[PDB]
Structure 1
Amino acid sequence: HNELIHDAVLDYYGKRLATCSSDKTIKIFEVEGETHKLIDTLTGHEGPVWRVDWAHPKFGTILASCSYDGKVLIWKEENGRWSQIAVHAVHSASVNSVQWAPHEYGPLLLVASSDGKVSVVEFKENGTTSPIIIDAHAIGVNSASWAPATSRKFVTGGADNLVKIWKYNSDAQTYVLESTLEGHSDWVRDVAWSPTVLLRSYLASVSQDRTCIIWTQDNEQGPWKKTLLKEEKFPDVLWRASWSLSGNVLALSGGDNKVTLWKENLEGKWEPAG
C-alpha cells in the first residue's frame, strides 16, 4: 500500500532512495536497478510528508524533510540506525519545499512554508540551528530553489504568482530581495534554477495556470527574458519542473500522467525531446 507518494529523492551517488508519502512515513530504499530493497521506514510527522531531500555527503548522511505538520525534521543515519537529530518549525503553516544549498555554503537548508516565509537554517558548531528567516510571499510560498555560483542567491515561487530572486548581503545579514518576476495567473507551483555554468542562466517556472515560463538572464546585468515554453495551456495543471545537470534539459511534471522534456535549440526556443 502506497497509493500516493508526494516526493522522492536520490543521493549524490544514487544508492539510497528516500520516498515520502501522505501516511507521514518516509521510506528509505537500497536501490539496485530493478530491486529497491526497503531498508527503513521513518515515522515522525503529524501530516503528509511533502518533500524529502538528502544533503551533501560531506555532511555525513543527513536528510531534511518537510511535512504538513508545519515542522521541518532533520534526520540522520547513525551506525545503520536512523534518528531525528534536529527540527525547525518556525513556520505557522504547512511547509512545502526544503532544499539544501551548494556544499560550499556550509550545510545551509532552504525551507519554504505557507506562512509566506522562507528560512535558511545553519547548523553551528554544536550542531544546533541558527535560523535567519525572511518574508517571501503574501498568500504563501509553494516552492524555493537554490542557485549555484562562484553573491549567493535563490528563487521562490509564490501563491501570488510571483517568482522572486533573493541575494545574500553582509550589510543586512538577512537575504535581501533583488528581483521579482511576474508572469503567471495562478499559484506558482514549482521554480527551478539550472545548474548550467554556461554563458547564461535559466529558470523554469511551472504554474497552476498550466504554463511554464523560462527566465533566461543574459548575464549579471541585463534583466530576465520571459519565454512561455509553448504558447498553449497544458491539458492539466503543472506541478514540478526540474533541470538536468549535464545538458540543460528540462523535465516537466504535469498533472497529465506523463513527464515532458524540453531542450533549448539554436533558435533559443525550446523543443520537445524523448
Structure 2
Amino acid sequence: VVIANAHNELIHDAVLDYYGKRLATCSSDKTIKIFEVEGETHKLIDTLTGHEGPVWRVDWAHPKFGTILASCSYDGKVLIWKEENGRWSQIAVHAVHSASVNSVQWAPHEYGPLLLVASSDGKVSVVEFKENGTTSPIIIDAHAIGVNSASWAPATSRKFVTGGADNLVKIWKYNSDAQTYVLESTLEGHSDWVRDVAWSPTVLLRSYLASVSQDRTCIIWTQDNEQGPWKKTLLKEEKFPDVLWRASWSLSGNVLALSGGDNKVTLWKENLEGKWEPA
C-alpha cells in the first residue's frame, strides 16, 4: 500500500492512530495531512495549518480523550489538534521552549492526557490540559547542546527516557519531594548526537530501551530489575552504513524497527543469547 506524493516538500513523520487505520503526515511545507487507508487505496481528509516552520513530528493520542493529534516544529512550539463533528481545529498551543521542538509524545492513557516534549534548547516539558483548558507544565533542563527525543516508559512510578545531542541517554522518574522529574540514570555509550530513544512497551520483567545515533550505531539498553544497572548491548558489532534516525518498537513481540539514513529500514528481534538478529 503506497500513498505517493502526500506532500511536495520532504516529509518527516507519518503515524497511524490507535486503530492503525487513520494516517497522518508532516513535513517542511509546515503542514500536517490526515489520510484514510484501506486495502491499497487512500483518501486525503484534511491539511492542518499553523506551524511557522517545518513540522518535525506527530503523535496520536489515546481514543479515550477524543480524536487528537499533537505536533511540534522547528518553530519551537507544539500544537494539539481535534476532529470534533467532522472537522479538525487547533484547540491548544504549547510553547515554552526557545528552540526547535523535535519530539512530542502522549503518555500512557492511564496518566491522563499528558504530553512529553523535547527541544534543541536542552529542556524537556511535561504538559497536561487543565480542567478549564490552559496549561501549567513541568520544565526541566535535561541535556547540554540540545534534546532530540523523549519516550515514556510503560505504566507500573512514572519514567521516561530522553536522548540528547550531548551523546547521552537519560532515564527520568517523577519525585514528590520535588514535584518534578529527577535524573535517575545517565547512560554513556554513543560518541555522537543521539537522534532518538524508544522505551519498549513489552510487559516482561526486563525493560528495553533502544537509542539511535549520529554515530551509526543502535544500542539496546536493558534492565533486569530495580537492583540491576542499565546494560549496554550494540545492535550489531559493525557500525551501520549511515546515520540511524529513528527507533520504534512493535506493540507485541518486542520487535525493533530501525530507520537508517541510507533510507533503509531493518527489523530486529532478540534471541536465546540476548543478542539481536534480523526478524
Tell me if TM exceeds 0.5: yes
Please tell me whether the aligned partners of residues 121 and 146 of structure 2 are also in contact (alpha carbons under 8 angstroms). Answer: yes
Q: CA deviation at 1:2?
A: 2.8
Distance 1:135 1:76 in 2: 30
The separation in 2 between residues aligned to 1:25 and 1:205, in whole angstroms, is: 28
Note the C-alpha offset of 1:149: 2.2
**Gap runs ≥5 in structure 2:** 1-6
Q: Counterpart in 2 of 1:71? A: 77
Give distance in 1, aligned partners of 2:107 and 2:39.
Answer: 28
Distance 1:202 1:15 in 2: 27
Q: Distance in 2 between matches of 1:73 and 1:187?
A: 26
Residues 3/88 of structure 1: CA separation in 2 closer, same or farther (3 Å cut): closer
Distance apart, 1:33 and its partner CA: 2.3
Q: Output the CA distance in 1 between the equivalents of 2:182 and 2:236.
A: 32
1:202-221 pair list within 5 angstroms: 202-221=208-227
Counting matched residue pairs gives 273
Structure 1 runs of 4+ aligned residues shifted over 2 Å read none
Instruction: Find the counterpart in structure 1 of residue 180 from structure 2.
Output: 174
Partners of 2:133 and 2:66 lie apart in 1 by 13
Paired residue secondary structure (2:176): coil
Computed over aligned residues only, the root mean square deviation of the Cα atoms, in angstroms, reads: 0.9
Specify the SS of the correspondent of 2:82.
strand
CA deviations on 1:203-259 (whole Å, 9 max, x unpaired) are 111101001111111111110111111111101111001111110111100111220
Provide the C-alpha distance between the structure 2 equivalents of 1:32 and 1:44, rounded to a whole number of angstroms.
Answer: 28
2:10 maps to which of 4, 11, 19: 4
In the alignment, the residues of structure 1 paired with residue 205 and residue 171 of structure 2 have an alpha-carbon distance, to the nearest angstrom, of 19
- Percent identity of paired positions between Structure 1 and Structure 2: 100
Q: Scaled by the length of structure 1, what TM-score is found?
A: 0.98
TM-score, length of structure 2 as denominator length: 0.96
Deviation digits for residues 141-183 of structure 1 (CA, Å, limit 9, x no counterpart): 0100111122100000000000000001111111111111000
- Residue aligned with 2:257, SS: strand
How far residue 32 of structure 1 moved from its aligned partner, in angstroms, is: 1.1
Distance 2:205 2:170 in 1: 22
Deviations 1:81-128 (A, max 9, x none): 111010011000000000000010011000101000110101110122
**Deviation of the 1:132 alpha carbon:** 1.1
Deviation at 1:3, TM superposition (A): 4.7
Taking the aligned partners of 1:14 and 1:251, their CA distance within structure 2 comes to 16
What's the counterpart of residue 97 of structure 1?
A: 103
Partner Cα separation in structure 2 for residue 130 and residue 107 of structure 1: 13
Q: How far, CA to CA, are the matches of 1:268 and 1:52 in structure 2?
A: 32
- How far apart, in 2, do the equivalents of 1:54 and 1:74 lie? 10
SS of the counterpart of 2:150?
A: strand
Secondary structure of 2:110's aligned partner: helix
Q: 5+ residue gaps in structure 1? A: none
C-alpha separation in 1, matches of 2:62 and 2:8: 28
Question: Is the CA contact 2:169–2:188 (under 8 Å) kept in the aligned structure 1?
Answer: yes
Alignment of 1:94-133 (within 5 A): 94-133=100-139
Cα-to-partner distance string for 1:59-81 (whole Å, 9 max, x where unaligned)? 10111100111011111112111
Tell me the residue number matched to 2:159.
Answer: 153
Report the Cα offset of residue 30 of structure 1.
1.4
In structure 2, distance between residues paired with 1:132 and 1:199: 29
Q: Provide the C-alpha distance between the structure 2 equivalents of 1:69 and 1:3, rounded to a whole number of angstroms.
A: 17
Give deviations 1:3-37, integer Å, cap 9, x for gaps.
52100111101221111111001000112121120
Contact 2:9–2:29 (CA under 8 A) maintained in structure 1? no
Q: Secondary structure at the match of 2:71?
A: strand
Partners of 1:221 and 1:20 in 2: CA distance: 41
1:125 aligned counterpart, secondary structure: coil
SS in 2 for 1:222: coil
Equivalences for residues 1-274 of structure 1 within 5 A: 1-273=7-279
SS in 2 for 1:40: strand
Cα deviation, residue 199, structure 1 = 2.2
